[PDB]
Design an enzyme around this catalytic site. Sequence first.
Site, mmCIF file in Angstrom:
data_model
loop_
_atom_site.group_PDB
_atom_site.id
_atom_site.type_symbol
_atom_site.label_atom_id
_atom_site.label_comp_id
_atom_site.label_asym_id
_atom_site.label_seq_id
_atom_site.Cartn_x
_atom_site.Cartn_y
_atom_site.Cartn_z
ATOM 1 N N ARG A 166 47.275 -4.042 23.069
ATOM 2 C CA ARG A 166 48.619 -4.500 23.407
ATOM 3 C C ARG A 166 49.568 -3.329 23.627
ATOM 4 O O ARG A 166 49.867 -2.608 22.713
ATOM 5 C CB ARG A 166 49.150 -5.470 22.322
ATOM 6 N N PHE A 217 58.577 -0.347 24.296
ATOM 7 C CA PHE A 217 58.435 -0.898 22.939
ATOM 8 C C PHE A 217 57.377 -0.104 22.145
ATOM 9 O O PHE A 217 57.739 0.716 21.268
ATOM 10 C CB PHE A 217 58.157 -2.396 23.037
ATOM 11 N N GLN A 246 49.834 -0.695 20.669
ATOM 12 C CA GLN A 246 49.177 -1.231 19.445
ATOM 13 C C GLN A 246 47.671 -1.179 19.582
ATOM 14 O O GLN A 246 47.079 -1.611 20.633
ATOM 15 C CB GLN A 246 49.639 -2.672 19.152
ATOM 16 N N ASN A 268 51.020 -6.014 11.103
ATOM 17 C CA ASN A 268 50.724 -6.926 10.036
ATOM 18 C C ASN A 268 50.980 -8.340 10.501
ATOM 19 O O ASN A 268 51.541 -8.566 11.568
ATOM 20 C CB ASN A 268 51.475 -6.581 8.685
ATOM 21 N N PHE A 326 50.631 0.562 15.264
ATOM 22 C CA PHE A 326 51.325 0.784 16.518
ATOM 23 C C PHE A 326 52.038 2.143 16.575
ATOM 24 O O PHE A 326 52.443 2.692 15.516
ATOM 25 C CB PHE A 326 52.242 -0.404 16.839
ATOM 26 N N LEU A 332 62.213 -3.594 12.800
ATOM 27 C CA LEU A 332 60.967 -3.606 12.039
ATOM 28 C C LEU A 332 61.072 -2.890 10.686
ATOM 29 O O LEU A 332 60.174 -2.966 9.859
ATOM 30 C CB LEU A 332 59.824 -2.981 12.873
ATOM 31 N N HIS A 348 57.452 -3.427 8.409
ATOM 32 C CA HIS A 348 56.226 -2.704 8.747
ATOM 33 C C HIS A 348 56.273 -1.333 8.078
ATOM 34 O O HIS A 348 57.339 -0.695 8.080
ATOM 35 C CB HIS A 348 56.106 -2.545 10.250
HETATM 36 C C1 LIG Z 1 47.683 -11.185 17.427
HETATM 37 C C2 LIG Z 1 47.888 -10.135 16.727
HETATM 38 C C3 LIG Z 1 48.066 -8.923 15.911
HETATM 39 N N1 LIG Z 1 49.200 -9.022 14.988
HETATM 40 C C4 LIG Z 1 48.813 -9.694 13.795
HETATM 41 C C5 LIG Z 1 47.984 -8.853 12.838
HETATM 42 C C6 LIG Z 1 48.352 -7.566 12.549
HETATM 43 C C7 LIG Z 1 47.665 -6.831 11.607
HETATM 44 C C8 LIG Z 1 46.591 -7.359 10.950
HETATM 45 N N2 LIG Z 1 45.912 -6.635 10.060
HETATM 46 C C9 LIG Z 1 46.206 -8.649 11.234
HETATM 47 C C10 LIG Z 1 46.906 -9.390 12.172
HETATM 48 C C11 LIG Z 1 50.391 -8.529 15.284
HETATM 49 O O1 LIG Z 1 50.475 -7.780 16.208
HETATM 50 N N3 LIG Z 1 51.495 -8.847 14.628
HETATM 51 C C12 LIG Z 1 52.801 -8.306 14.983
HETATM 52 C C13 LIG Z 1 52.868 -6.811 14.767
HETATM 53 O O2 LIG Z 1 52.347 -6.295 13.838
HETATM 54 O O3 LIG Z 1 53.601 -6.037 15.726
HETATM 55 C C14 LIG Z 1 53.889 -4.661 15.567
HETATM 56 C C15 LIG Z 1 54.925 -4.306 16.618
#
Ligand SMILES: C#CCN(Cc1ccc(N)cc1)C(=O)NCC(=O)OCC
Length: 165
Positions: free
Chosen positions: A55, A60, A63, A102, A113, A122, A126
Amino acid sequence: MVNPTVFFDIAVDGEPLGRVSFELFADKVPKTAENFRALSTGEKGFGYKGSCFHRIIPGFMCQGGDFTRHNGTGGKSIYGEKFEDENFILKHTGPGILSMANAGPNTNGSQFFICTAKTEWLDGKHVVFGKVKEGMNIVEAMERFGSRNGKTSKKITIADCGQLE
Ligand SMILES: C#CCN(Cc1ccc(N)cc1)C(=O)NCC(=O)OCC
């Protein structure tokens, strides 16, 4: 006592792009820094080598770190499937900040990210644990393969990774 440095060699549809290196703030967030460091060397038997940036949203963040499902739904930490939010001492102050992705409180795994803008909203949600040291230009080049919805136009991979002396 010197913070560790790790590298990522980035490829674009298999073709080498460049290296990005990171300072890990083990002085402030040791548990979180250690996880990223170990995943970067592969010394626990699993980790980031070969995985992709799934992603990427220009203006921004980029990731990655989902080495089990390759799309944001997987990954795991060196402590178990997930681990707590260690602290929120450090903030998302601008481009180059390295922070944990997360899915809610206390759900850190392996996904992270790299910010390419200030992402203040954030802060406190985070865990910030490092920053780009060298190769922010390479991050900027990766960022150009992303899109508004995060889908990349070419496959962006960590062809190699590890720890710098
Ligand atoms: C779909 C998806 C992935 N995810 C959920 C996620 C993140 C970390 C872990 N360990 C598990 C799920 C995320 O990307 N959640 C939002 C995030 O963390 O954005 C940072 C800018």
